[PDB]
Design an enzyme around this catalytic site. Structure first.
Site, PDB file in Angstrom:
ATOM      1  N   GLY A 195       3.098   5.532  10.158  1.00 60.81           N
ATOM      2  CA  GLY A 195       4.380   5.399   9.550  1.00 60.81           C
ATOM      3  C   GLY A 195       5.189   4.186   9.927  1.00 60.81           C
ATOM      4  O   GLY A 195       6.290   4.053   9.510  1.00 60.81           O
ATOM      5  N   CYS A 248       4.317   1.047   9.208  1.00 55.22           N
ATOM      6  CA  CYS A 248       4.157  -0.101   8.330  1.00 55.22           C
ATOM      7  C   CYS A 248       5.481  -0.475   7.681  1.00 55.22           C
ATOM      8  O   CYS A 248       6.339   0.378   7.409  1.00 55.22           O
ATOM      9  CB  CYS A 248       3.088   0.175   7.274  1.00 55.22           C
ATOM     10  N   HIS A 260       0.805  -1.221   0.000  1.00 55.22           N
ATOM     11  CA  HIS A 260       0.000   0.000   0.000  1.00 55.22           C
ATOM     12  C   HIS A 260       0.840   1.275   0.000  1.00 55.22           C
ATOM     13  O   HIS A 260       0.270   2.368   0.073  1.00 55.22           O
ATOM     14  CB  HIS A 260      -1.005   0.001   1.165  1.00 55.22           C
TER      15      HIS A 260
HETATM   16  C1  LIG Z   1       1.118   1.883   8.219  1.00 49.84           C
HETATM   17  O1  LIG Z   1       2.027   2.808   8.747  1.00 49.84           O
HETATM   18  C2  LIG Z   1      -0.205   2.069   8.976  1.00 49.84           C
HETATM   19  C3  LIG Z   1      -0.048   1.532  10.410  1.00 49.84           C
HETATM   20  C4  LIG Z   1      -1.270   1.902  11.302  1.00 49.84           C
HETATM   21  C5  LIG Z   1      -1.403   3.382  11.369  1.00 49.84           C
HETATM   22  C6  LIG Z   1      -1.425   3.772  12.839  1.00 49.84           C
HETATM   23  N1  LIG Z   1      -1.147   2.520  13.658  1.00 49.84           N
HETATM   24  C7  LIG Z   1      -1.061   1.362  12.711  1.00 49.84           C
HETATM   25  O2  LIG Z   1      -0.846   0.232  13.015  1.00 49.84           O
HETATM   26  N2  LIG Z   1      -1.198   1.298   8.261  1.00 49.84           N
HETATM   27  C8  LIG Z   1      -2.441   1.872   7.802  1.00 49.84           C
HETATM   28  O3  LIG Z   1      -2.690   3.011   8.021  1.00 49.84           O
HETATM   29  C9  LIG Z   1      -3.410   0.962   7.056  1.00 49.84           C
HETATM   30  C10 LIG Z   1      -3.261   1.117   5.544  1.00 49.84           C
HETATM   31  C11 LIG Z   1      -4.268   0.201   4.854  1.00 49.84           C
HETATM   32  C12 LIG Z   1      -4.185   0.364   3.336  1.00 49.84           C
HETATM   33  C13 LIG Z   1      -3.989  -1.250   5.218  1.00 49.84           C
HETATM   34  N3  LIG Z   1      -4.759   1.331   7.410  1.00 49.84           N
HETATM   35  C14 LIG Z   1      -5.164   1.240   8.791  1.00 49.84           C
HETATM   36  O4  LIG Z   1      -4.448   0.742   9.598  1.00 49.84           O
HETATM   37  O5  LIG Z   1      -6.405   1.742   9.164  1.00 49.84           O
HETATM   38  C15 LIG Z   1      -7.247   0.755   9.674  1.00 49.84           C
HETATM   39  C16 LIG Z   1      -8.687   1.243   9.558  1.00 49.84           C
HETATM   40  C17 LIG Z   1      -9.813   0.243   9.288  1.00 49.84           C
HETATM   41  C18 LIG Z   1     -11.052   0.681   9.193  1.00 49.84           C
HETATM   42  C19 LIG Z   1     -11.355   2.175   9.338  1.00 49.84           C
HETATM   43  C20 LIG Z   1     -10.385   3.033   9.569  1.00 49.84           C
HETATM   44  C21 LIG Z   1      -8.949   2.528   9.686  1.00 49.84           C
END
Ligand SMILES: *[C@H](O)[C@H](C[C@@H]1CCNC1=O)NC(=O)[C@H](CC(C)C)NC(=O)OCc1ccccc1
Ligand SMILES: *[C@H](O)[C@H](C[C@@H]1CCNC1=O)NC(=O)[C@H](CC(C)C)NC(=O)OCc1ccccc1
Lengths: 299, 299
Positions: free
Chosen positions: A141, A143, A39
């Site tokens: 950040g 990931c 992503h």
């Molecule tokens: C990557 O850095 C990030 C890690 C998250 C951000 C804050 N703490 C974490 O573990 N990953 C994402 O932001 C991820 C990206 C997607 C394309 C997989 N999305 C996410 O974690 O949001 C989850 C979510 C699900 C349903 C509604 C709102 C957010």
């Protein structure tokens, strides 16, 4: 006994940052390949329902900024393997350790090197839960941070971080990009299944207590594995596998307490509680120490 | 929210093995000096009651075998600074980080890199207890393991390990060789002073519980600083100073919970107990997270 991470230095030397547009995350640089969550190619708006095959078609090698510190590594090839990107770079990492890619089982533990912008920030031990989540500590950040075990200077990479669930727990892939659990990399509302207690690890912790002299809970009964498994599920404990019985072997031999005898001791703890007593100074049964963690910490 | 250690790689590159006679332990190799506990020069009988200046005058450079991995370093000088031995070697450590030697205060935290035979084994977080012990995980051969904090490329060394007390807690020195607490490097049973709980750290941890969505322990009461300290001392908690209240400022501002409102919460917790409930999965009030630890992890 304490939760103890592996020394993180061999992995630290492999962390890089990967930027696409304004999206930056972490990657793992081994030989001349950088592995990172796919992503990174998403803009904020594309993350609701991305079409990764279509988004990748629009990308060339020159759209990927890979940096080790502030030093750019030129990308000479890219491909997608499940949920991870593999970016071939023009420099082989001279600090590549002996390594393996492995897929762990629920209950197994690993060290996480939490990173931001390719810079290591902290290290801590995690267990894979039976619902295929981990109780991590991750910020925006993070990931591309990885989880690993080390066996005789060989690093076994088992986790790469992708997302947070609404309950505050985290989800990710192995290093072939295959999620643990029924999760997908879309910014959609996802729910972890109900979790259970990791029975093999609680038994390992009872052996650790016995090794240190705390054995009040040993009883005079035994059980069959099948009868134990059926009662354990009534208490939301995981059933034991044949592999679970075998990895408790060394601790059973050390203490002279048969694996199924300890199962009967645990069963009585579940049916009656601890009656105000503690085990290793704790009123709660710990379930994130594996049999290897107990052996490693006592040796 | 997890107990998180600093990445250990910069320290790993500094660990060596030091052998004198039949005693082996770890050393810290910075530039052209190796630092290690002075009891390495002791035999079994010596340890029981050593006269260190007398024992050290009788040693030659060649009595010390220093190993960095497989490669022997040649000792070309040796001096003693309190309980630490400084071995001058003919080779400079090519991976010596920017570093400082600091003496930490009770209640402050640090990361421990546990080592055996000069090889790093595990990393975990410790706090300097008010009675100047630490609750570590250390075994035979772990002496010379160090504790440290990292601030932007600079490693601040604060602890070197020397012994385990009969209670199972641990004692050691700063890198100038001065013990934390009333302890001595003699093989004799030693007791520590009565320990107390680090109050500012318990409050920081309660704020971490709120930042992570847990609020069951909050109340509508408030309290003065002095009235809180009266109850705290009654429960063997360290006094809370105005400096502590200030250090909690950012955490109060983030949660909207005034520090003295959180003190009223902890007072009710101390007087009523937890009623078998848990905070951040713990059945006890945790005191090994500083306010900085909470901020760093939570932001
Ligand atoms: C990557 O850095 C990030 C890690 C998250 C951000 C804050 N703490 C974490 O573990 N990953 C994402 O932001 C991820 C990206 C997607 C394309 C997989 N999305 C996410 O974690 O949001 C989850 C979510 C699900 C349903 C509604 C709102 C957010
Ligand atoms: C150094 O490797 C070793 C580390 C100890 C060993 C077991 N767990 C540890 O942390 N330190 C010592 O062995 C130390 C050496 C003295 C000369 C300071 N002695 C010790 O830790 O035992 C103290 C003791 C004496 C008498 C009764 C009970 C404990």
């Amino acid at each position: 006994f304490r939760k103890m991470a592996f020394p993180s230095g061999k992995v630290e030397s492999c962390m890089v940052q990967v930027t696409c547009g304004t999206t930056t995350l972490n990657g793992l640089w081994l030989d001349d390949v950088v592995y990172c969550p796919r992503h990174v190619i998403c803009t904020s708006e594309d993350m609701l329902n991305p079409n990764y095959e279509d988004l990748l078609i629009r990308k060339s090698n020159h759209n990927f900024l890979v940096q080790a510190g502030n030093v750019q590594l030129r990308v000479i090839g890219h491909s997608m393997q499940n949920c991870v990107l593999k970016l071939k770079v023009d420099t082989a990492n001279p600090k590549t350790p002996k390594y393996k890619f492995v897929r762990i089982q629920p209950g197994q533990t690993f060290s996480v090197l939490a990173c931001y912008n390719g810079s290591p920030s902290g290290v801590y031990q995690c267990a894979m839960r039976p619902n295929f989540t981990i109780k991590g500590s991750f910020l925006n950040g993070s990931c591309g941070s990885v989880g690993f075990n080390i066996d005789y200077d060989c690093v076994s990479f088992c986790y790469m971080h992708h997302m947070e669930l609404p309950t505050g727990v985290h989800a990710g892939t192995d290093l072939e990009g295959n999620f643990y659990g029924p999760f997908v990399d879309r910014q959609t509302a996802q729910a972890a299944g109900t979790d259970t207690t990791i029975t093999v690890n609680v038994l390992a912790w009872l052996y650790a207590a016995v090794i240190n002299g705390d054995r009040w809970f040993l009883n005079r009964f035994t059980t069959t594995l099948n009868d134990f498994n059926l009662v354990a599920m009534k208490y939301n404990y995981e059933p034991l596998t044949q592999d679970h019985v075998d990895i408790l072997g060394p601790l059973s031999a050390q203490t002279g307490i048969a694996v199924l005898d300890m199962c009967a001791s645990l069963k009585e703890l579940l049916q009656n509680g601890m009656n105000g007593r503690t085990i290793l100074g704790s009123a709660l049964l710990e379930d994130e120490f594996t049999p290897f963690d107990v052996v490693r910490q006592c040796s």
